[PDB]
């Protein structure tokens, strides 16, 4: 009573709330995009609705942040859903990394929610371990995520250029343990921990940048999933088994992937490599027999024990009793950093970068059809309402 | 560039703009109402859109102004689209008159725009001659217009209780000429000028309250209409002829109705009364022969000339050269008011009202099916997006 208008206005001012101005503005743009067809305009309700909102919706699109406000400098990445571009804001002259997700393929492959957790993690984590999202916007064909540009590349590139000693492996693994703990702290399970999603900032420190497979845990820190997700080499046995139905696992699947990552860093090969994907899946499931260290692998007993501690069945895997039993594993005993200050210390490898558009740590890329015209209302832009966000 | 966000925000703060917060909030509520059905939720896009907006939309409806915030004191009117109720705001203890328009019958009879001009005239006219709209809101079944309560009743009630002398007729006609000039000033043609739409305020002064038939004039002060509108007794010949197609008329149709009103006031009968509606239409068209004054009608030559000046074909009707030739007709020569101060002078009849809920000048009323469940998206709440307005 009386303060109900002030309470309602408070919901529209909250960027966490799904009814903020940009989300309400999306609700209108999506409706105009999904009704503006010759076929649907046969409806007297639709045609009169469009006649009074067509002009203003087209003015609003042009007034809002658009793809045209950035100069594409170079395409540095290219997933199945779209490319990651090194862009420069025309007005601010600032260099960001912008991810494009095809609205066609994201809707077409049924995948229309994986980006929500990515959006919320980047926009609101406020963690030094998570790449920050400055602006999320969209157009009829793509979603756009303007994020901080990580100029040092990924850990795949590092491993390809260096024989990683255990002094460096201790470091990168610790930064990954803390980044995952920050994600788990936010009530999420990564599910796609791999060196490809571990980026290095301008000083050589780690940040996790891809969050497509993230999934919110229930009040028991558990997840119910009947679909295998992640990269073949790093999928834990519990996530593989989940494909057959009755999938019930927790955050320990991320610690499995850490162990695969640490093995790859020290050995130079994935622990369960095979030519077929099914050959890799067989080795992962049969880990008790298939996990072995090459006789030329220069690895300590502590490093081997930590890898074996992670590469076991979830029931007895390190990390089941919290992150503290990971942090106090003798492998992390070092005279360069502490868990409370590791990000303030010198990184093993500091990227050499001549300019704000230097993308030397990213391999060159050598350069998504249109949605069909609907006979009846389909509402293809409906899963995208509320994607827009401005920091 | 840069100020584009401030320019965009300025559109959402403007109550005249169709993309203000309440209009954007309507766009969401209408979408949720028109998609929440078992049949439509078979669509993967629709079902997932609803799952993330159902809870918050139902919280927003309850937070916003609702029909339940008013105490219905008495039903005082009852048109074909809905009733006018004398209500009292539960929190403010303030008495308003609230008009309910059936969303079912307004959509069902194809009439889904007549209320727009009424809403804008009342909400934004700021004229002492137009009843003010304080809040416009809506629910799944009705539109709601919370307006100032006119406690003196209409001119039909006055004429039924009094033998109106020409001293009073000069007054009520002048107030009607100024009220229509204010509407014409706003670029509108009333089209339904009748004593039923002329209400008396707490002091006995006039205000026009129904604007359903209003129509915006083009840059030539003309309108293109192929449909007869208004009340049979007061329809001008040009509006009757418009029914046969090729309707092109201006604001002079309102001056015709003024003359019918003045005749009714002085003679006590409508100038073209007949038992059939077609008998009335014949008399209106044949006005040159059918208009006559009873030999017992106590009317002056100036009053008869003004009525005849209004009841002619549009081509030569008084008001074609502006409102000044109406204002200087000798019939208005009086020693009580001037055109510039008529509303500050004493009204002929001041209503006797014991309390803020006294509705003695309104006859007692002796007390709209549901929309069908749609197989495919119909968007029945779409013509109502942007009706909500809070002063
Ligand atoms: C920079 C890059 C980014 N993405 C990104 C792009 C390409 C990547 O690697 C390619 C493909 C995988 C194997 N190695 C080469 C990795 C990450 C982001 C995301 C946010 N900020 C960023 N700044
Ligand atoms: C009071 C009344 C109002 N409507 C209204 C209701 C009933 C009317 O008359 C009945 C039917 C026609 C013949 N005579 C009796 C006229 C106008 C409004 C509108 C805004 N404020 C109001 N305050």
PDB file of C-alpha atoms in Angstrom, chain A residues 2-5 7-8 11-13 18-19 21-25 27-28 31 35 43 45-46 49 52-53 56-57 59-60 63-65 91 107 116 376-386 390, chain B residues 2-5 7-8 11-13 18-19 21-25 27-28 31 35 43 45-46 49 52-53 56-57 59-60 63-65 91 107 116 376-386 390:
ATOM      1  CA  UNK A   2       1.437   3.347  -1.332  1.00  0.00           C
ATOM      2  CA  UNK A   3       5.107   2.067  -1.181  1.00  0.00           C
ATOM      3  CA  UNK A   4       4.050  -0.636  -3.750  1.00  0.00           C
ATOM      4  CA  UNK A   5       5.080   1.698  -6.623  1.00  0.00           C
ATOM      5  CA  UNK A   7       8.847  -1.480  -4.414  1.00  0.00           C
ATOM      6  CA  UNK A   8       7.900  -2.136  -8.076  1.00  0.00           C
ATOM      7  CA  UNK A  11      12.693  -4.312  -9.278  1.00  0.00           C
ATOM      8  CA  UNK A  12      13.144  -2.436 -12.570  1.00  0.00           C
ATOM      9  CA  UNK A  13      16.354  -0.712 -11.245  1.00  0.00           C
ATOM     10  CA  UNK A  18      14.552 -10.134 -15.031  1.00  0.00           C
ATOM     11  CA  UNK A  19      12.196  -7.137 -15.386  1.00  0.00           C
ATOM     12  CA  UNK A  21      14.332  -1.710 -18.506  1.00  0.00           C
ATOM     13  CA  UNK A  22      16.660  -3.538 -20.958  1.00  0.00           C
ATOM     14  CA  UNK A  23      14.754  -6.833 -20.382  1.00  0.00           C
ATOM     15  CA  UNK A  24      11.380  -5.123 -20.866  1.00  0.00           C
ATOM     16  CA  UNK A  25      12.780  -3.422 -24.015  1.00  0.00           C
ATOM     17  CA  UNK A  27      10.371  -8.200 -24.641  1.00  0.00           C
ATOM     18  CA  UNK A  28       9.123  -5.607 -27.121  1.00  0.00           C
ATOM     19  CA  UNK A  31       7.667  -9.507 -30.121  1.00  0.00           C
ATOM     20  CA  UNK A  35       5.331 -10.976 -35.555  1.00  0.00           C
ATOM     21  CA  UNK A  43      -4.280 -11.351 -37.775  1.00  0.00           C
ATOM     22  CA  UNK A  45      -4.605  -8.013 -33.502  1.00  0.00           C
ATOM     23  CA  UNK A  46      -1.020  -8.482 -34.784  1.00  0.00           C
ATOM     24  CA  UNK A  49      -0.047  -3.895 -32.729  1.00  0.00           C
ATOM     25  CA  UNK A  52       1.858   1.424 -33.625  1.00  0.00           C
ATOM     26  CA  UNK A  53       5.244  -0.046 -32.606  1.00  0.00           C
ATOM     27  CA  UNK A  56       9.594   3.261 -32.418  1.00  0.00           C
ATOM     28  CA  UNK A  57      11.138  -0.265 -32.256  1.00  0.00           C
ATOM     29  CA  UNK A  59      14.397   3.863 -33.546  1.00  0.00           C
ATOM     30  CA  UNK A  60      15.193   1.994 -30.260  1.00  0.00           C
ATOM     31  CA  UNK A  63      19.705   4.155 -30.390  1.00  0.00           C
ATOM     32  CA  UNK A  64      20.944   1.102 -28.413  1.00  0.00           C
ATOM     33  CA  UNK A  65      24.493  -0.408 -28.504  1.00  0.00           C
ATOM     34  CA  UNK A  91      33.956   6.079 -29.535  1.00  0.00           C
ATOM     35  CA  UNK A 107      18.097 -22.122 -31.348  1.00  0.00           C
ATOM     36  CA  UNK A 116      22.536 -17.543 -19.241  1.00  0.00           C
ATOM     37  CA  UNK A 376       2.358 -19.484 -37.572  1.00  0.00           C
ATOM     38  CA  UNK A 377       3.867 -17.683 -34.515  1.00  0.00           C
ATOM     39  CA  UNK A 378       7.068 -19.481 -33.509  1.00  0.00           C
ATOM     40  CA  UNK A 379       8.641 -16.993 -31.102  1.00  0.00           C
ATOM     41  CA  UNK A 380      12.243 -17.822 -32.029  1.00  0.00           C
ATOM     42  CA  UNK A 381      13.563 -14.638 -30.322  1.00  0.00           C
ATOM     43  CA  UNK A 382      11.738 -15.505 -27.054  1.00  0.00           C
ATOM     44  CA  UNK A 383      14.627 -17.518 -25.428  1.00  0.00           C
ATOM     45  CA  UNK A 384      16.783 -14.354 -25.874  1.00  0.00           C
ATOM     46  CA  UNK A 385      14.591 -11.905 -23.879  1.00  0.00           C
ATOM     47  CA  UNK A 386      16.717 -10.422 -21.125  1.00  0.00           C
ATOM     48  CA  UNK A 390      24.984  -2.774 -19.800  1.00  0.00           C
TER      49      UNK A 390
ATOM     50  CA  UNK B   2      27.512   8.474 -25.904  1.00  0.00           C
ATOM     51  CA  UNK B   3      24.363  10.678 -25.310  1.00  0.00           C
ATOM     52  CA  UNK B   4      22.345   7.921 -27.142  1.00  0.00           C
ATOM     53  CA  UNK B   5      21.657   6.195 -23.780  1.00  0.00           C
ATOM     54  CA  UNK B   7      18.305  10.111 -25.394  1.00  0.00           C
ATOM     55  CA  UNK B   8      16.881   6.555 -25.127  1.00  0.00           C
ATOM     56  CA  UNK B  11      11.832   8.278 -24.291  1.00  0.00           C
ATOM     57  CA  UNK B  12      11.081   5.869 -21.429  1.00  0.00           C
ATOM     58  CA  UNK B  13      10.505   8.822 -18.983  1.00  0.00           C
ATOM     59  CA  UNK B  18       4.584   4.530 -26.254  1.00  0.00           C
ATOM     60  CA  UNK B  19       7.732   2.940 -24.765  1.00  0.00           C
ATOM     61  CA  UNK B  21       7.952   1.696 -18.273  1.00  0.00           C
ATOM     62  CA  UNK B  22       4.196   0.988 -17.865  1.00  0.00           C
ATOM     63  CA  UNK B  23       3.866   0.315 -21.641  1.00  0.00           C
ATOM     64  CA  UNK B  24       6.909  -1.986 -21.633  1.00  0.00           C
ATOM     65  CA  UNK B  25       5.479  -3.737 -18.524  1.00  0.00           C
ATOM     66  CA  UNK B  27       4.087  -5.709 -23.341  1.00  0.00           C
ATOM     67  CA  UNK B  28       5.273  -8.413 -20.951  1.00  0.00           C
ATOM     68  CA  UNK B  31       2.641 -11.770 -23.803  1.00  0.00           C
ATOM     69  CA  UNK B  35       0.875 -17.586 -24.242  1.00  0.00           C
ATOM     70  CA  UNK B  43       6.147 -24.915 -28.234  1.00  0.00           C
ATOM     71  CA  UNK B  45      10.250 -21.544 -27.097  1.00  0.00           C
ATOM     72  CA  UNK B  46       6.961 -20.550 -25.391  1.00  0.00           C
ATOM     73  CA  UNK B  49       9.877 -18.231 -21.879  1.00  0.00           C
ATOM     74  CA  UNK B  52      11.218 -17.788 -16.336  1.00  0.00           C
ATOM     75  CA  UNK B  53       8.553 -15.037 -16.324  1.00  0.00           C
ATOM     76  CA  UNK B  56       7.585 -12.338 -11.668  1.00  0.00           C
ATOM     77  CA  UNK B  57       4.595 -11.379 -13.900  1.00  0.00           C
ATOM     78  CA  UNK B  59       4.155 -10.503  -8.575  1.00  0.00           C
ATOM     79  CA  UNK B  60       4.063  -7.384 -10.854  1.00  0.00           C
ATOM     80  CA  UNK B  63       2.183  -4.872  -6.955  1.00  0.00           C
ATOM     81  CA  UNK B  64       0.509  -2.592  -9.556  1.00  0.00           C
ATOM     82  CA  UNK B  65      -2.803  -0.660  -9.125  1.00  0.00           C
ATOM     83  CA  UNK B  91      -5.977   4.021   0.911  1.00  0.00           C
ATOM     84  CA  UNK B 107     -12.215  -7.015 -28.912  1.00  0.00           C
ATOM     85  CA  UNK B 116      -7.011   5.528 -27.214  1.00  0.00           C
ATOM     86  CA  UNK B 376      -2.914 -21.083 -31.905  1.00  0.00           C
ATOM     87  CA  UNK B 377      -1.494 -17.683 -30.769  1.00  0.00           C
ATOM     88  CA  UNK B 378      -4.228 -15.056 -31.105  1.00  0.00           C
ATOM     89  CA  UNK B 379      -2.758 -12.141 -29.156  1.00  0.00           C
ATOM     90  CA  UNK B 380      -6.101 -10.853 -27.859  1.00  0.00           C
ATOM     91  CA  UNK B 381      -4.384  -8.644 -25.218  1.00  0.00           C
ATOM     92  CA  UNK B 382      -2.135  -7.026 -27.879  1.00  0.00           C
ATOM     93  CA  UNK B 383      -4.494  -4.072 -28.747  1.00  0.00           C
ATOM     94  CA  UNK B 384      -4.350  -3.151 -25.007  1.00  0.00           C
ATOM     95  CA  UNK B 385      -0.542  -2.730 -24.688  1.00  0.00           C
ATOM     96  CA  UNK B 386       0.139   0.769 -23.425  1.00  0.00           C
ATOM     97  CA  UNK B 390      -0.472   6.716 -13.788  1.00  0.00           C
TER      98      UNK B 390
END
